[PDB]
Amino acid sequence: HTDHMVSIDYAEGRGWHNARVIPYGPIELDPSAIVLHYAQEVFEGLKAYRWADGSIVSFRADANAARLRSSARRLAIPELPDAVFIESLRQLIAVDKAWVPGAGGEEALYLRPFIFATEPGLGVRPATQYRYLLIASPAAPVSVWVSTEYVRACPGGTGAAKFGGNYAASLLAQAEAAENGCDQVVWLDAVERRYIEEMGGMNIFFVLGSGGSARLVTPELSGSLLPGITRDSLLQLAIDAGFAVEERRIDIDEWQKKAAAGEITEVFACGTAAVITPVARVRHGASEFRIADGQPGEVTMALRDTLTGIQRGTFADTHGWMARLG
Amino acid sequence: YHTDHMVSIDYAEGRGWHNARVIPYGPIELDPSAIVLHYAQEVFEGLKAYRWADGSIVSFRADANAARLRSSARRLAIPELPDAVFIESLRQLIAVDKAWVPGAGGEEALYLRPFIFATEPGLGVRPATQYRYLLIASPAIAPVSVWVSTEYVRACPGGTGAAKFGGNYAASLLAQAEAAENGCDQVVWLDAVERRYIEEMGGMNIFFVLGSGGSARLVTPELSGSLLPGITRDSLLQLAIDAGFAVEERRIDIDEWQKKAAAGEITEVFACGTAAVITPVARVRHGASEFRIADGQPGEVTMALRDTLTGIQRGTFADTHGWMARLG
Ligand SMILES: Cc1ncc(COP(=O)(O)O)c(CNc2co[nH]c2=O)c1O
Ligand SMILES: Cc1ncc(COP(=O)(O)O)c(CNc2co[nH]c2=O)c1O
């Protein structure tokens, strides 16, 4: 973690107030603070990048701001205004700027904005007191384990929110994966236990065919998986590069069948931390199957090169995704 | 409000659960990266301590809570707190804060809140290697109306609904607001997959009474894997059998509830749980539909069971099943 953190308080009637930059250090809670009992909390994640001209920039921070608000609404948490969200990013970079790594490769500074209920009380109801903190931390094909025993979120629930509870529910599967020598978990839909949703901390894309004829398929926003900002961006970039894209349902049977037939030629996972991570093989119960030759796919690495290029300030930001933080 | 003291126990991978100690009730500290603040790795319980006429403090089925906290812990990848350490923590707090247990023998008792949360600093999504357990205490039949949630779902099969886990409660807060907006006091939740089978209330299990007198049948949702196996629920099923009522655990459709209530087949409805013991349900809102349960008054079977269970917990009715045990 870096040297400082940004703290902001909420009190009913007063709104979000008392924003201040303080050292990174322990915080205090009443034993009956609602977050310790009923998990009323939401969070975000995004990076600060250093550019060649010496500036520090963010990638689609406005999207994170709005998503923290969408998550907060689902959890009955008062929304942090986008302007205050953005300003907290600027405040932290101003004091901890030396922590942002050099330009220009994979290295960046990870920013963790988060909100938790602090009001003391064992009644099960939305809190009237909260805290927001902003902290910072300095920041290869994988195998995936299909979870059949566990479900992470369901329609009408909290899966489209970045809510701590979704991650808690995933811990046992994430241990069961490692016990099968897999790197990550792919989650299936709650209702029919068939349709691909997402991985534990990433969205998932499928490449079908190859060359100019190659096209992208990704699970549609079901209501129970996260609308990732990397996912959103890659949809836009694929369209920019002339790839057909389909947001639709795809189940594990279609995945296995089309991979075996060689129609699915690449699979990749995407998210803020790794940008894009190739998926080489899949374990589904007793069976295992490989994606193509198990190596990083052509479209996979082309999209990754485009997106990291924009983020590092090497390639034109045609969508106006980058903004200055310091 | 809270009593004077709390019990604190730490978990670390070399020591396991250790350093159990009675300390004043007061603020606790967490690293900003403590896993509970990001990924909600936490579970909890709730039970009461009762003062009896003879001066003793007793627990009701505290062994059941000890085991359920372990079951909850297991589902949330939390190292289990041994049952003996759980029971001892109840005894430790009652020993110093006994004077806080209210007088015998009405509705008043001392509510106990055992709870575990992840304290290890780290932003990696993995089970914590460090936890804290706290035990805190807090001093503790009007019919209610219920709103059937059709828009929100509280837990998923394959999920965490059979565990007493903070995240189930977090997920439920938005629906509880829609209920108030429609005049109702509590929320009834339906199953995730088919959006039609009755699960439970936000903090209580639900029962239906069919018919009347000795031939009445007590009906309750079967354990689905996504609703909480309430200890009050478990006890009332036994008490119903003791009394000679037929009991049925099964899947019950929401469209069956209103239909049988309107036909006079469902004669009573109630909710049960640690805090209120039994709360009669008078009225139900489901979408546009609204229906009443009989005359809206507490039902005969409802109050017979409530009187028996409260009687056992206050020591005035014979404890045939050995549910009551000395705390201090
Ligand atoms: C469940 C889940 N799905 C998808 C994603 C990808 O979302 P994106 O990053 O906005 O593209 C994340 C990562 N979300 C996080 C982003 O930064 N830290 C995170 O935990 C996630 O936790
Ligand atoms: C979702 C849910 N279902 C059912 C119940 C009833 O469970 P029982 O009390 O064991 O009969 C509770 C209350 N659980 C609590 C028991 O004490 N404090 C509580 O929050 C609950 O929170």
UniProtKB/Swiss-Prot annotation, chain A:
Residues that bind pyridoxal 5'-phosphate: 67, 167, 229-230, 272
Functional pathway: Amino-acid biosynthesis; L-isoleucine biosynthesis; L-isoleucine from 2-oxobutanoate: step 4/4; Amino-acid biosynthesis; L-leucine biosynthesis; L-leucine from 3-methyl-2-oxobutanoate: step 4/4; Amino-acid biosynthesis; L-valine biosynthesis; L-valine from pyruvate: step 4/4
EC number: 2.6.1.42
Record-linked SUPFAM superfamilies: D-aminoacid aminotransferase-like PLP-dependent enzymes
Any GO BP: branched-chain amino acid metabolic process
InterPro entries: Aminotrans_IV (IPR001544), Aminotrans_IV_CS (IPR018300), Aminotransferase-like (IPR036038), B_amino_transII (IPR005786), BCAT-like_C (IPR043132), BCAT-like_N (IPR043131), BCAT_family (IPR033939)
Keywords: Amino-acid biosynthesis, Aminotransferase, Branched-chain amino acid biosynthesis, Pyridoxal phosphate, Transferase
Top-rank EC class of the record's enzyme: transferase
Top-level taxon of the source organism: Bacteria
Molecular function per GO: branched-chain-amino-acid transaminase activity; L-isoleucine-2-oxoglutarate transaminase activity; L-leucine-2-oxoglutarate transaminase activity; L-valine-2-oxoglutarate transaminase activity; pyridoxal phosphate binding
Residue positions, PTM N6-(pyridoxal phosphate)lysine: 162
Catalysis performed (reactions): L-leucine + 2-oxoglutarate = 4-methyl-2-oxopentanoate + L-glutamate; L-isoleucine + 2-oxoglutarate = (S)-3-methyl-2-oxopentanoate + L-glutamate; L-valine + 2-oxoglutarate = 3-methyl-2-oxobutanoate + L-glutamate
Regulation: Inhibited by ammonium sulfate at millimolar concentrations and by O-benzylhydroxylamine (Obe).
The protein's required cofactors: pyridoxal 5'-phosphate
Family: Belongs to the class-IV pyridoxal-phosphate-dependent aminotransferase family.
Subunit structure: Homodimer.
Its biological purpose: Catalyzes the reversible transfers of an amino group from glutamate to the alpha-ketoacid of the respective amino acid in the final step in the biosynthesis of branchedchain amino acids. The amino acids can be ranked in the following order with respect to their efficiency as amino donor: Leu > Ile > Val.
UniProt name for this protein: Branched-chain-amino-acid aminotransferase
Source species of the chain: Mycobacterium tuberculosis (strain ATCC 25618 / H37Rv)
